[PDB]
Structure 1
Amino acid sequence: GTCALPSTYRWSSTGVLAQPKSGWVALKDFTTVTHNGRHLVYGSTSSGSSYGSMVFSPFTNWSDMASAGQNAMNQAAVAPTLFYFAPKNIWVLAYQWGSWPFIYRTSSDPTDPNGWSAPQPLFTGSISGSDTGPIDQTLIADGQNMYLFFAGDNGKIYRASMPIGNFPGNFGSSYTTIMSDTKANLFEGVQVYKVQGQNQYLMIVEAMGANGRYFRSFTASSLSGSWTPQAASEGNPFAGKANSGATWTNDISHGDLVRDNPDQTMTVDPCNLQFLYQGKSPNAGGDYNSLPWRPGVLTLRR
């Protein structure tokens, strides 16, 4: 009863799913799991001047995201990654910007924006030829190792690893440069997932297209293995203007595939693939940091 990833992706899209709370101009960089049968969503916020983070009050249906409470974190967790770490029965929120390049906090209740532990170092390395430094981390474990993947707004994708038994912990400064292309082709927003029912991992990377932001996909048989381009052009993207079915945005940008199993394996079901992304009105201009990003959800057409 298993499904495979398609060679060509076709989606349908929701409209804009929520408007930012008073004081914010954008909701961004989503990470989501299903928790107690409800959607649990963290994201970045922007006021235009400063970036913060938030969690939505849990909601069962995407169509009710618009009415969900928006709960600011007292300490910013920009571009967050949320998961449940089963081997230690603890939730993890990883993010960027703070005392170290990447940071994490832990909790027993991921619904509380302010119930997270003191910040701990996740990654302390540095990259060359980048205006941003390490950005847009994700974490994913198989049965043996925990992996860190990240970007640099510079055409490179990077990876680090540790035995799972040493996590939660600090990857330190070391990393592997696993992919190298143009800045436009491998920009940011990297995510990695286990494809349920297949001996396959899925990587998506946000690219800058002629028509807007879009995602390029790659596959691997192992998390330490090589990545083969799948749907990796603007005309044949993982998700973008070409195939999103979205009428409100020409950009499909930093988000997360919907993870029903909240655990560290980042497993997605190819039979019911959905993508919580950020988009924006095509008419919106101004400084990048003030852009009015909004959540939407793509559902894969089978």
Structure 2
Amino acid sequence: SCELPSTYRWTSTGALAQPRSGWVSLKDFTVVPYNGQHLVYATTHDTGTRWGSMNFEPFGDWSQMATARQNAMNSPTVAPTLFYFAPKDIWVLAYQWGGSAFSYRTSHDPTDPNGWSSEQVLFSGSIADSATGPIDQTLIGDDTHMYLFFAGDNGKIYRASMPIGDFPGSFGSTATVVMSDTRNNLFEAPQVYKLQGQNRYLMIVEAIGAQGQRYFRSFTATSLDGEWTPQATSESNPFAGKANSGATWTDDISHGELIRTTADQTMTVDPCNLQLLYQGRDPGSGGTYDLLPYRPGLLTLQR
């Protein structure tokens, strides 16, 4: 195995796909391996006010993301988390802005954008001092428990848990704060992973830098119910950001996901081959947040 570096150095692609006509952005990627291909769901925004979601047809290599058919979902699953819940042999798509704080649906065929079950409650809690409410869930399981982590655009990261045999189901209405900082330092888009070959878990969180540029900070833990330790936690020393991305097509390195070695709920990633599918936007872009022209990019860690 390969230890996480204390200084990350990446190289980047440019934008890997453009939104199909009618959408201004592709955002908040979730991605699994599927039958030897990449299966990606994403948030969309249209040219008016509508948040939506989509998947890409499975594609074999990252050059094929640009040509993969983009399939709209009839019922949106904004800021989605996709995984295979192996203990009950069912796929799960979790998301926000349905009927409760967080929702999920299930399927046996995650390539079908419109093949998901009816909406179920994932979380029904509220949080304090948040303009948005709970946002950007991520889920991960260990041997005995499933965990829900989320943010609130408020400087806090929250955790709920349930015995793994009780999942899929609702985590209830309460959560535990596991980290807090100034609003901009722990802002949104948390993602939690288990590192292959190591007794260690990795959390990355999106932050807002001094001039508004998005970047990620990282933290580690040795158990998912334990405490989190800063691993790379500033704009000049980030997990991934303009300081170290190798990207100039974007300054932002924002809401996305690490490439995983498995689709299942363990969220396992290979520390020897870390890659981040992120959302970025042209540095000249501006105006109202919801219309910003985000697109996917991929970072590959140098070792």
Matches of 1:285 and 1:243 in 2, distance apart? 23
Q: CA deviation at 1:178?
A: 1.0
The reply on whether 1:142 has 2:149 as its aligned counterpart is no
1:236-255 pair list within 5 angstroms: 236-255=237-256
Measured in 2, the distance between the counterparts of 1:178 and 1:3 equals 27
Aligned to 1:44: 43
Q: Distance in 2 between matches of 1:207 and 1:174?
A: 24
Query: Offset at 1:64?
Result: 1.1
Task: Give the whole-Å Cα distance in 2 for the aligned partners of 1:263 and 1:215.
Answer: 24
With the length of structure 1 as denominator, give the TM-score of the two structures. Answer: 0.99
User: Aligned partners of 2:302, 2:101: CA distance in 1, in Å?
Assistant: 38
- Matched residue count: 301
Rounded to whole Å, the distance in 1 between the matches of 2:301 and 2:118 is 38
In structure 2, distance between residues paired with 1:160 and 1:284 = 37
- Structure 1: tracts of 5 or more residues without a match: none
Deviations 1:5-25 (A, max 9, x none): 111111000010000011100
Who is 1:191 aligned against?
A: 191
SS in structure 2 opposite 1:184? helix
Q: Which residue of 1 aligns with 2:90?
A: 90
**Counterpart check, 1:7 vs 2:6:** yes
Instruction: Give 1:63 deviation, angstroms.
Output: 1.0
Q: CA offsets, 1:219-244, max 9 Å, x none?
A: 00000000000110000000000000
> Which residues in structure 2 correspond to 1:70-149 (within 5 Å)?
70-149=70-149
**How far 1:260 moved relative to its partner?**
2.5
2:25 partner amino acid: A
Q: Which residue of 1 aligns with 2:65?
A: 65
1:281-296 equivalent positions in 2, closer than 5 A = 281-296=282-297
Q: Which residue of 1 aligns with 2:223?
A: 222
Which 4+ stretches in 1 moved above 3 angstroms? Answer: none
Match of 1:16 in 2: 15
Q: CA RMSD in A?
A: 0.6
Is 1:297 the equivalent of 2:298?
Answer: yes
User: How far apart in 2 are the matches of 1:170 and 1:289?
Assistant: 29
Q: How does the TM-score come out when normalised to structure 2?
A: 0.98
- Distance in 1, matches of 2:116 and 2:28, equals 19
Structure 2 unaligned residues grouped into runs of 5+ = none
Q: For residues 38 and 298 of structure 1, what CA distance do their matches in structure 2 show?
A: 18
1:99-139 CA-to-partner distances (Å, cap 9, x unmatched) read 11100000000000000000100000000100000000000
1:98 Cα offset (Å):
1.2
Partner residue, 1:29: 28
CA distance in 2, matches of 1:98, 1:203: 25
**Structure 1 letter corresponding to 2:247:** A
**Residues of 2 paired with 1:122 and 1:98: CA distance?**
10
- The residue type paired with residue 35 of structure 2 is N
In structure 1, what residue type is equivalent to 2:267? M
